[PDB]
Amino acid sequence: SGFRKMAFPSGKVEGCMVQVTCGTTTLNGLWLDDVVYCPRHVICTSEDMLNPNYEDLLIRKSNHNFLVQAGNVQLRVIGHSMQNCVLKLKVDTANPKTPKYKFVRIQPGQTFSVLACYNGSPSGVYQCAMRPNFTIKGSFLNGSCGSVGFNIDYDCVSFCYMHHMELPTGVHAGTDLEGNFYGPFVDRQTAQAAGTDTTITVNVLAWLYAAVINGDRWFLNRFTTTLNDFNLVAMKYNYEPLTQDHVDILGPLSAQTGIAVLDMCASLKELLQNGMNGRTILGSALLEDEFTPFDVVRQCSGVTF
Amino acid sequence: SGFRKMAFPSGKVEGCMVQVTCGTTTLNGLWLDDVVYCPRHVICTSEDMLNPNYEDLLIRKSNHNFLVQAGNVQLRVIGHSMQNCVLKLKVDTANPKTPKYKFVRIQPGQTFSVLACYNGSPSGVYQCAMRPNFTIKGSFLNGSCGSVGFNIDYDCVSFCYMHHMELPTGVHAGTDLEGNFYGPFVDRQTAQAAGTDTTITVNVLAWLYAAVINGDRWFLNRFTTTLNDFNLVAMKYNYEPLTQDHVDILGPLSAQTGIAVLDMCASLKELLQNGMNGRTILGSALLEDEFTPFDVVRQCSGVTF
Ligand SMILES: O=C(Nc1cncc2c1CCCC2)[C@@H]1CNS(=O)(=O)c2ccc(Cl)cc21
Ligand SMILES: O=C(Nc1cncc2c1CCCC2)[C@@H]1CNS(=O)(=O)c2ccc(Cl)cc21
Ligand SMILES: [Cl-]
Numbered sequence A, B: 001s002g003f004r005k006m007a008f009p010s011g012k013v014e015g016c017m018v019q020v021t022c023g024t025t026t027l028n029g030l031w032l033d034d035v036v037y038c039p040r041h042v043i044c045t046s047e048d049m050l051n052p053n054y055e056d057l058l059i060r061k062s063n064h065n066f067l068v069q070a071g072n073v074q075l076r077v078i079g080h081s082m083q084n085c086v087l088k089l090k091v092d093t094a095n096p097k098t099p100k101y102k103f104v105r106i107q108p109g110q111t112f113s114v115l116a117c118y119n120g121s122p123s124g125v126y127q128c129a130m131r132p133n134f135t136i137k138g139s140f141l142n143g144s145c146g147s148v149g150f151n152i153d154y155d156c157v158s159f160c161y162m163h164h165m166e167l168p169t170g171v172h173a174g175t176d177l178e179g180n181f182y183g184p185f186v187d188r189q190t191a192q193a194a195g196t197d198t199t200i201t202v203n204v205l206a207w208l209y210a211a212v213i214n215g216d217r218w219f220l221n222r223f224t225t226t227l228n229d230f231n232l233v234a235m236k237y238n239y240e241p242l243t244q245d246h247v248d249i250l251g252p253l254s255a256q257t258g259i260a261v262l263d264m265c266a267s268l269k270e271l272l273q274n275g276m277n278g279r280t281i282l283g284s285a286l287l288e289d290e291f292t293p294f295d296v297v298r299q300c301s302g303v304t305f
Helices: A054-059 A201-213 A227-237 A244-249 A251-257 A261-274 A293-299 B054-059 B201-213 B227-236 B244-249 B251-257 B261-274 B293-299
Strands: A017-022 A025-032 A035-039 A066-070 A073-075 A077-083 A086-091 A100-103 A111-118 A121-129 A148-151 A156-166 A172-175 B017-022 B025-032 B035-039 B066-070 B073-075 B077-083 B086-091 B100-103 B111-118 B121-129 B148-153 B156-166 B172-175
Touching: A017 A035, A017 A121, A025 A066, A035 A156, A054 A077, A066 A077, A066 A086, A111 A156, A201 A244, A201 A251, A201 A261, A201 A293, A227 A261, A244 A251, A251 A261, A251 A293, B017 B035, B017 B121, B025 B066, B035 B156, B054 B077, B066 B077, B066 B086, B111 B156, B201 B244, B201 B251, B201 B261, B201 B293, B227 B261, B244 B251, B251 B261, B251 B293
Parallel strands: A100 A156, B100 B156
Antiparallel strands: A017 A025, A017 A066, A025 A035, A035 A086, A066 A073, A077 A086, A111 A121, A111 A148, A148 A156, A156 A172, B017 B025, B017 B066, B025 B035, B035 B086, B066 B073, B077 B086, B111 B121, B111 B148, B148 B156, B156 B172
């Protein structure tokens, strides 16, 4: 029993964190095999950030301008290349702690663990979701750039995010491990803003199924809804539209609890109208949207209470 | 910016998790140097749990009755002894991954990270607090016994909890690494219940300081209070009494934000008497009490390990 915001064990990622320095700029790098991946803005000064010409800044650099530190050992850079917004530094030593891994680009609503790091040293781990507006609500200070997001389903680490910047509202933007930004963001200091954010509907439904699995049904009602009527109501509360894909994905949780997806949608419609009336659901007074259907199945018992 | 429920990086603890089997009972063990620590109830059958005599159950066991598996390698048990509610299995191999460590007993209100494990394999990491009623609100299923709680100080892991059982309300109970329970619990199948819990006042105040640091100030007011008047009000809401030690501990956060501790106590009094009025603090509609003053300082400073 219980339901917590649970991160994957971070050990496999801790053994890949290194410090990358170019001149006065220092940030984190991810060392996999003989390559260190880091944000390309490590070659920028603060002044360069308004309109940096990365190709022009990079051509003026040699391999020995990049200092890579793994623990107390200095790695030797023997090559470099830029791929989108990431810099790939070829080093003379393959990481002996390289886990089994993949690079995966995720979609909004997907969750992942973040290993926050400073000076190549891990400080903490927490669970995040890629918001519908392509930002993440992380906890990052200056020096956290290059910290990564990942999942570890089975023994393979799927790297899905690398931290690049903090927007004016205090939310965060970054790239996949191929250097492609999530969202319409650029690694430039020009005026940029997070778009209006919305609630991840499929995740709220998954978490309501987690509450039923753990023994709570107070929020259920005798009604059902059509998918279109549900979406007309949901969008009035700034909730993402629920698609047939989301309904299909909730199938297993619907079978385990015996509650049809559109019947759970009717409960959600009522919760949006009434609020909780002094009650909580899984220790929360707000509707939680950072647990996916897959996260609920992973954390909850297969036997409903 | 940002504020997340953050756990310590778990790698140093992952390298200590093993699987312990005695007959039909399988659970997790902690392998440090040449000793494997695990709940002594691993020697019990379901019937034995009703009224166990652990010395009598243990005397009937030989070293080869305990199967210890570290990854895909079988460890050889060469000795065994009991210390309070913990079984210490001496093995023929010292753990090459043993980190620098200490066994520490924590007090209610203190937080720690939990590495949930099943079959000696880590599945997730989350942060929690030792409640005033000595339970923890964890997330554990069958097979999680032997999972451990810890804090990291510089490079030293301080092990503070080992999981033993779930109470009827779905909350959890366990021991320190010397086998002494937290709370008035016993390791047997008998009528046991979590006592009435209270809110950790010093932690709520720490989290209100974190909200101010992160730019949430709507709850601040011009008023102050005495420590005695604050405690008279706090007692009415099932909040733990605030002591002069708690006021002293909040000193640094008070200096950083410019808000006296008793000034923040007056904001907390108003929040208890009037609610949030449709507002949230750090994305929560409830007053959060599972962040200590030290957790707030650490997360808002980027301390690494
Ligand atoms: O956003 C940035 N850093 C950063 C990342 N995470 C957390 C925090 C910070 C800054 C202080 C607050 C906490 C930088 C610098 N600021 S910037 O506007 O020059 C900028 C712009 C683009 C890129 Cl790719 C990067 C950046
Ligand atoms: O509590 C216990 N295990 C356990 C731990 N974490 C999570 C979960 C469980 C059981 C299934 C549900 C989820 C056991 C069995 N139950 S018991 O009451 O027989 C018991 C009693 C004492 C001791 Cl030390 C242990 C136990
Ligand atoms: Cl995805």
